């Protein structure tokens, strides 16, 4: 019974996130969006954050440890358990984390400050999220389809 | 619309972009919306110039809230491309934030410029 209630709570969290912030829900999804809203406190409190802040929300202990001891800061925070940074591998993971955090900052500012005529469909209420997700998936597949370095193909002699 | 401290007079717009170019050569300038937000939140920012040609205008509307909380003057120029190549960027810059220091002719220009922005408000 606890599992059934937790499943319907996850469905409710998804529906309420698509109600509140359709752009960010179209970008990363309802659970990671709810984690970001939770850490920042509110939607208009998340919207006042730069993209570099939204990149490393949640990784703050490692961040301030590294900043105070002149180590190297963490590359991402809560954003790591989104969908779109999990397809990459290698340094393209950190590059996609940067780009995704910037698009999340734009989408949260749009979902927290833009007005709508109240007869506005959800497909046009999540327009910035749709456009940013399509562009960001194109940039991800370019970063993954970057070819490897050419080499000299040697014969059996060494010639 | 939502850009109510608009700089519409072209003499004032030319003065704002000339001071932006001088601060850019002094490396006293923070370019971009995220870097502008960081400078305004940290409180090092003396004046902040947003652009009104932003196609979703709501992606720079959070900076008026932080400037109302931190009491720094913000103003809207017409063209983001003009702001961009005023900073010397070769991109479209939608928000810029120019900072202050101990003693400069540039700091005197900053004080006079925020007096003119307070005349707009």
């Amino acid at each position: 019974e606890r599992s059934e209630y937790r499943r319907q709570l996850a469905e409710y969290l998804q529906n309420r996130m698509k109600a509140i912030s359709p752009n960010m829900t179209e970008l990363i999804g309802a659970l990671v969006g709810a984690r970001l809203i939770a850490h920042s406190g509110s939607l208009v409190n998340l919207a006042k954050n730069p993209g570099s802040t939204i990149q490393i929300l949640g990784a703050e202990k490692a961040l301030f440890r590294a900043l105070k001891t002149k180590h190297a800061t963490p590359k991402y925070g809560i954003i790591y358990h989104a969908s779109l940074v999990g397809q990459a591998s290698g340094p393209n993971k950190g590059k996609i984390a940067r780009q995704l955090a910037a698009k999340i900052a734009l989408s949260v500012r749009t979902d927290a400050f833009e007005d709508f005529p109240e007869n506005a469909d959800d497909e046009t209420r999540a327009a910035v999220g749709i456009q940013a997700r399509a562009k960001l998936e194109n940039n991800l597949r370019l970063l993954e389809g970057k070819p490897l370095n050419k080499g000299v193909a040697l014969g059996p002699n060494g010639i | 619309s939502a850009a109510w401290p608009k700089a519409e007079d072209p003499a004032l717009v030319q003065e704002l972009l000339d001071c932006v170019q001088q601060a850019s050569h002094y490396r006293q300038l923070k370019k971009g919306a995220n870097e502008t937000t960081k400078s305004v939140n940290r409180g090092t920012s003396e004046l902040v110039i947003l652009a009104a040609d932003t196609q979703p205008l709501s992606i720079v509307l959070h900076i008026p809230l932080i400037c109302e909380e931190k009491n720094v003057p913000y103003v809207y120029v017409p063209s983001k491309v003009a702001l961009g190549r005023a900073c010397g960027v070769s991109r479209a810059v939608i928000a810029v934030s120019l900072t202050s220091n101990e003693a400069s002719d540039l700091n005197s220009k900053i004080r006079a410029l925020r007096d003119k922005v307070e005349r707009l408000a």
Partner: peptide
């Protein structure tokens, strides 16, 4: 630069709190 920025944020918060406390401790009125 990152270390100096964090130390400057901490020191600016300390200055704001100390200046508030100093004003609270200690042709004006017509």
């Amino acid at each position: 630069l990152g270390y100096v920025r964090t130390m400057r944020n901490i020191a600016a918060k300390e200055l704001k709190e100390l200046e508030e406390r100093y004003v609270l401790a200690g042709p004006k009125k017509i």
